[PDB]
Structure formats: structure tokens, C-alpha cells
């Protein structure tokens, strides 16, 4: 009687694999299934990942971005079936796990504090250039 495994077992059927790895500070574009009255189209949503709170399948993440003046935060179930894909627009190196403090910074400061994560960018250009010789001949 593993209470835990029993739970993780139930979830397993609903788990995703396809979404790419990311960390706070990274800029990210979530293509999301929405409802326009009748139909269902994809809307993109793109900003800094200010937060990830892990809890296995129940893990989630918050994206912040400004639109037409007003700042907006959106909170996504990481294994939501409404996520069509997730794009890594840009990678940045944050010095902490929760980035709410940028709620109060000028887009100039936000820029100065969140430098581009060269290491993980390099690895990203390294990989994918890596996996390409078999997606060929």
C-alpha cells in the first residue's frame, strides 16, 4: 500500500513529455487552446516566466508580460492538454526561484537584472544542431 504511488499511478495517464525544459527568467511563448463562442483557436501568450511551483504532475508556472499598458500574469498547469506547444523565445539567468520583484521594475531595469543565460543558450544552439544529422539521411 503505497499511497503515493497509487496517486502517481492515476496521474501517469495524463502526464506530458513533449514540452521543453525551462527555468524562471526565461522568456516563453505558450500557444493555448481557447474558446471563441463556438470555435476553438490558438492564442499565443509570451512573457517572462516569473515562477514555477513543482508538485509532480500538478506542477504549474506563471508567465508575466505587459500588453497595451497593463501588466498581465497567466498561470498554466504544466501538463494541461490545452497547451498546444511551448516555445523558448529567449533564455535568461535569474538569481532566484521566484521573480515577483520584477513586478516593480522599469522595463529598463527588468532588462538590466535579467541578463541572457549564455550557458544555456549555447547548450541550446549546441543541442538541436546536435540532433539534426539523423533527421536527414
Amino acid at each position: 500500500m503505497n499511497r503515493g504511488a497509487l496517486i502517481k499511478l492515476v496521474e501517469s495517464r495524463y502526464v506530458r513529455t513533449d514540452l521543453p525544459e525551462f527555468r524562471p527568467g526565461d522568456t516563453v511563448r505558450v500557444s493555448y487552446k481557447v474558446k471563441e463562442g463556438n470555435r476553438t483557436r490558438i492564442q499565443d501568450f509570451e512573457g517572462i516566466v516569473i515562477r514555477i511551483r513543482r508538485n509532480g504532475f500538478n506542477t504549474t508556472f506563471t508567465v508575466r508580460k505587459v500588453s497595451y499598458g497593463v501588466g498581465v500574469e497567466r498561470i498554466f498547469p504544466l501538463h494541461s492538454p490545452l497547451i498546444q506547444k511551448i516555445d523558448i523565445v529567449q533564455r535568461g539567468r535569474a538569481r532566484r526561484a521566484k521573480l515577483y520583484f520584477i513586478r516593480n521594475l522599469s522595463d529598463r531595469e527588468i532588462r538590466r537584472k535579467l541578463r541572457a543565460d549564455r550557458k544555456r543558450i549555447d547548450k541550446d544552439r549546441a543541442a538541436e544542431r546536435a540532433a539534426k544529422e539523423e533527421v536527414q539521411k
Binding site: 500500500m1 499511497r3 503515493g4 497509487l6 496517486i7 499511478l9 492515476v10 496521474e11 495524463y14 487552446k33 504532475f57 500538478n58 498547469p77 494541461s80 492538454p81 490545452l82
Partner: protein, 204 residues
């Protein structure tokens, strides 16, 4: 009437038709019948159910004999589902379909000795503006020389929770027979690891 014994294992949420749904999970199966209650013998109708297998090297002699007349290896819990008379020998979680509706009974979590604010949601006094030491206190509890006593059942501080609680009309989200699992939309009283009873609902 139909129902099963079980153990609350935990909560998560699943997805269904692109809506999230909170569920608590219950390990129900299986449950061997141990005794039936006839009207000829007992004056009412119900079935005793066994649940969770017991270390025989801990079962005593009166208990062992009741278990013999049944003809089933010992078990840790005996509980009756009233007015349920299972055609079969062992009650399985199979008795529920996704979509059905169930009443669940479990023991609520135990608050111990609880204030009148936690037990009964009294407002208590003001956190400022003059209050001499009555910030969480119950206020007045009566009138004056008439009646000159306190009502029976007056809401007062005392033990809270750790008690029988039944929550009605929970939807069966899903059942997983190969694990004896049960998914119910909503919340079920008591801690995980706790005993629960899942009856067919009484609401029409």
C-alpha cells in the same frame, strides 16, 4: 442500496473535456462478505463487509471463529452496508460506474479542543478600540433573571471534528478495477489512510 469499504489515498485533479476536475482517490476493493443479516435472524437487512487483510498471527479465537463460519481469511475491519444484499460473494469497486453518484462517510480530522471561533465561527471581539482580553471570546451566553439559565445546546468551545461525517452526491469521475481504485469529484472527510464508506447516493 449498495456500497463498499475503502481507504482515502489522496487528491489530485484530472482533465476531462478540457476542464480540470479535482478528485479524491479511494482504494475500495475488494471486500469479502463475512455475514448477511436476514430479518429472520436479525430483523433487518444488511451485509457485513471485510476490508484490509489481517495478520492471522494477531486474530483471537472468538474473531477467528466468526471468520471460519464465513470461510474467508481474516481481515482488519468489519462494517455493514445496510439494505445491501450482494448477489455475489465479494463486493468489488465494479459496483460503481463512472457517472454514478455516491455518498461518502469517513471520520473528520480532529481539531481537539476548539475555540468558539473555529468550532462555531463566532465573530469574537474587536482586535482593538478598547477590548480588555476578550478578543476571541463568545460574548454573552444568556439573558438575565429570566430564564436564569443557559439553553441546552448553546454553542460553546469544546472538541471539534474527529467525528462521523457524510458528504452527499459526489460524482464518480472514474473507476480503475485493476487497482481497486475509485475517483470521486470533490472532497472526502478525514485524513488519507482513513477508513471511508462509499454508498450509492440517496439524492434523486
Amino acid at each position: 442500496m449498495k456500497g463498499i469499504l475503502g481507504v482515502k489515498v489522496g487528491m489530485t485533479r484530472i482533465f476531462r473535456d478540457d476542464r480540470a476536475v479535482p478528485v479524491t482517490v479511494i482504494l475500495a476493493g475488494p471486500c469479502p462478505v463475512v455475514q448477511r443479516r436476514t430479518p429472520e435472524k436479525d430483523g433487518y437487512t444488511a451485509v457485513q463487509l471485510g476490508f484490509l487483510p489481517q495478520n492471522p498471527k494477531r486474530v483471537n479465537r472468538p474473531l477467528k471463529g466468526h471468520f471460519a463460519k464465513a470461510g474467508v481469511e481474516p481481515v482488519r475491519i468489519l462494517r455493514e452496508i445496510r439494505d445491501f444484499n450482494p448477489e455475489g460473494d465479494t463486493v468489488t469497486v465494479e459496483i460503481f460506474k463512472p457517472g454514478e453518484r455516491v455518498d461518502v462517510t469517513g471520520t473528520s480530522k480532529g481539531r481537539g479542543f476548539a475555540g468558539v471561533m473555529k468550532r462555531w465561527n463566532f465573530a469574537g471581539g474587536p482586535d482593538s478600540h478598547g477590548a480588555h482580553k476578550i478578543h476571541r471570546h463568545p460574548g454573552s451566553i444568556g439573558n438575565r433573571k429570566t430564564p436564569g439559565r443557559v439553553y441546552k445546546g448553546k454553542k460553546m468551545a469544546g472538541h471539534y471534528g474527529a467525528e462521523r461525517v457524510t458528504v452527499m452526491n459526489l460524482e464518480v469521475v472514474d473507476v480503475i478495477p485493476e487497482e481497486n481504485l475509485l475517483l470521486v469529484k470533490g472532497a472526502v472527510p478525514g485524513p488519507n489512510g482513513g477508513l471511508v464508506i462509499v454508498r450509492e447516493t440517496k439524492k434523486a
